[PDB]
Write a protein that binds this ligand. Structure first.
Ligand SMILES: Cc1cc(C(=O)NC2C[C@H]3CC[C@@H](C2)N3c2ccc(C(=O)NCc3ccccc3)cn2)c(C)cc1C(N)=O
Ligand SMILES: Cc1cc(C(=O)N[C@H]2C[C@H]3CC[C@@H](C2)N3c2ccc(C(=O)NCc3ccccc3)cn2)c(C)cc1C(N)=O
Lengths: 204, 204
C-alpha cells in the first residue's frame, strides 16, 4: 500500500466541500454518472478503430448499487478505466487551474461539473470513497481516501472487473437517503435522464 | 440595434483567442455541438411535464450547413434557445470565474469546454459570429460580434425559426477547410460521434 499527499489545490477543494454546508448535494450522483458516460465514450471510440479493445467486455453500461447494511452506494461502469499513473498523478483534465477557478466561485456547488473536478462532489455525502478500476493497459487497482489530505493506492486482489471503474461511497450517517430506491430514481430522472448508456438500479 | 460592452474577462479571453497561435482549432465544432446538445436536453426535459413546450416544433436535432459562396459554416439546433436577457446578460453558467483562471492555464486550447466558455472557441476560425435564436418565452433575436470589445443585439424580423439557435461562423479566409465535407465529417467522428441527437451535414 502506497500513501500519497493530494495536490495542494485538491486538498483545498476537498476541505471546502467537507467543511461547508451545501443544500443541493444530490448533484454528486450526476457528476459520477457524467464521469462514467465520459469513460464509456472513450472506450467506445477506441473500439471503432480496434474492436479487440472490447476483449475485456463488450457491454457498455452504468450500474447503481445501494447497500443499506454496509451503508455504501456504488456506481459501476464498463468504461475505459484508469491506469496506476492516472491514480497517482491524477487525470490530465484535472488541472489546478480548473480547481482554483472553482473554489473562488464557491466563496451553486452544482457548478463543480463545469470545471473537471466533479468527482470530489462525492465528499458532499461520503466520509470515505474507494475507487476500484481496470484499464486495458494496466492491472486492477484500488484508490481510497477519507480526505484529510492523503490517499492510498494498492493493487486490487478482489473480484476481477474485466474493464471499467467502481466508485464506492461510504456514506455519512445523515446521508442515507441516497440508499433509497425512490431517491436514486428521482435524482437520475432529474439530472441524468438522457445519458446515452443504460443506467440500471440494482434493487435491494 | 443596441451595442453592448463585453464583460471585461470575456473581452480579454476573445483577444487571447484571436491574437494567439493555437494548433488544434477543430475543437471549436465540438464545443458548438456540445452547446446544441445541452440546449436540446433542456427543452426535452421541460416537454416531459408540459407537452405544449414542443408546439414550436417537436423535432430535436442538429444541422451543419457549410456555404462556400458566403464563406459561412452554420450550426443549427431546435434546442431551448436564448431570450434577449440571455443575449445581453450572458448565460448564468458563463461567469468570470471559469473565464479568468482558464486564460491563466493557457498563458491545450481544447480545455476550453471544461470551463463553460466553449462558445468563444468559434473565434479561433471566425472573424464574425452571428447568433440567431428563438426561445418559447421571447421574440426572435440576432446577436453578433466581430470582437473588439463589443457585441450587438437586435430583433430578427427575417426567417421565423420555430425554436432553437443558429450559430453562423463567418470564417477567416485561411480557415475555409471547415467548409469541406470530408473535414467536417472527420471532426464530428473524432469529437461528437455519440451525441444523443441526429447530426445532419448538408450537401452543397
Ligand atoms: C447553449 C448555447 C449557449 C450559447 C452561448 O454560450 N451563448 C452566449 C450568450 C450570448 C451569445 C453568444 C455569447 C455566449 N453571448 C454573450 C452575451 C453577453 C455577453 C456579455 O459579456 N455581456 C455583458 C456583461 C457585462 C458584465 C457582466 C456580465 C455580462 C457575452 N456573451 C450559444 C451561442 C448557443 C447555445 C445553443 N446552441 O443553444
Ligand atoms: C472518468 C472518471 C474520472 C474519475 C476521477 O476524477 N478520478 C480521479 C483520479 C483518482 C481517483 C479519484 C481522484 C480523481 N483521483 C486522484 C488521484 C490523484 C490525486 C492527486 O492529488 N495526486 C497527487 C498530485 C500531487 C501534485 C500534483 C499532481 C498530483 C487526486 N485525485 C473517476 C474516479 C472515475 C471515472 C470513471 N467512472 O471512469
Amino acid at each position: 500500500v502506497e500513501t500519497f499527499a493530494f495536490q495542494a489545490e485538491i486538498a483545498q477543494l476537498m476541505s471546502l466541500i467537507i467543511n461547508t454546508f451545501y443544500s443541493n448535494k444530490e448533484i454528486f450522483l450526476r457528476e459520477l454518472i457524467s464521469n462514467s458516460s465520459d469513460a464509456l465514450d472513450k472506450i467506445r471510440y477506441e473500439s471503432l478503430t480496434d474492436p479487440s479493445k472490447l476483449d475485456s467486455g463488450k457491454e457498455l453500461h452504468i450500474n447503481l448499487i445501494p447497500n443499506k447494511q454496509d451503508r455504501t452506494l456504488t456506481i459501476v461502469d464498463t468504461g475505459i478505466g484508469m491506469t496506476k499513473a492516472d491514480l497517482i498523478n491524477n487525470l490530465g483534465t484535472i488541472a489546478k487551474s480548473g480547481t482554483k477557478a472553482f473554489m473562488e466561485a464557491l466563496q451553486d456547488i452544482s457548478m463543480i461539473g463545469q470545471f473537471g473536478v466533479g468527482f470530489y462532489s462525492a465528499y458532499l455525502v461520503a466520509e470515505k470513497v474507494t475507487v476500484i478500476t481496470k484499464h486495458n493497459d494496466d492491472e486492477q487497482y484500488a484508490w481510497e481516501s477519507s480526505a484529510g489530505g492523503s490517499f492510498t493506492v494498492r493493487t486490487d486482489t478482489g473480484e476481477p472487473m474485466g474493464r471499467g471503474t467502481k466508485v464506492i461511497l461510504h456514506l455519512k450517517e445523515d446521508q442515507t437517503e441516497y440508499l433509497e430506491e425512490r431517491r436514486i430514481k428521482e435524482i437520475v430522472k432529474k439530472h441524468s435522464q438522457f445519458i446515452g448508456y443504460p443506467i440500471t438500479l440494482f434493487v435491494e
